[PDB]
Amino acid sequence: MPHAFKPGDLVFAKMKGYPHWPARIDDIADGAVKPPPNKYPIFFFGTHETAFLGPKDLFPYDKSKDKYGKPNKRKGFNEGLWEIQNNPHASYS
């Protein structure tokens, strides 16, 4: 059975006006800004942007990749597909 989301989990993350996007649940570094309550820090592959999202917008990668893991015109997306498949836990600073 599923657990709660934890840092390192791989997802497609959905925001308004964008396709479901390859992403990970990030850790929060010591001294870094924490997310609001009930929100997780989402690192978006390819763009390397962070947003704060709730579970309603987070689709586990394994289950969802056959639907969402296809090339997209949007800037950073295909780069994001490479990262999530090939080095999803690397530092992208």
UniProtKB/Swiss-Prot annotation:
Residues 7-64 form the PWWP domain. It is found in: Nucleus; Cytoplasm. Widely expressed. High expression is found in heart, skeletal muscle, ovary and testis. Overexpression is frequently observed in hepatocellular carcinoma samples. Belongs to the HDGF family. Acts as an epigenetic regulator of myogenesis in cooperation with DPF3a (isoform 2 of DPF3/BAF45C). Associates with the BAF complex via its interaction with DPF3a and HDGFL2-DPF3a activate myogenic genes by increasing chromatin accessibility through recruitment of SMARCA4/BRG1/BAF190A (ATPase subunit of the BAF complex) to myogenic gene promoters. Promotes the repair of DNA double-strand breaks (DSBs) through the homologous recombination pathway by facilitating the recruitment of the DNA endonuclease RBBP8 to the DSBs. Interacts with HDGF. Interacts with trimethylated 'Lys-36' of histone H3 (H3K36me3). Interacts with trimethylated 'Lys-79' of histone H3 (H3K79me3), but has higher affinity for H3K36me3. Interacts with IWS1. Interacts with H2AX, POGZ, RBBP8 and CBX1. Interacts with histones H3K9me3, H3K27me3 and H3K36me2. Interacts with DPF3a (isoform 2 of DPF3/BAF45C). Interacts with SMARCA4/BRG1/BAF190A, SMARCC1/BAF155 and SMARCD1/BAF60A in a DPF3a-dependent manner. This is Hepatoma-derived growth factor-related protein 2. It comes from Homo sapiens. The gene is HDGFL2. The chain holds residues 1 to 93 of 671 of the full protein.
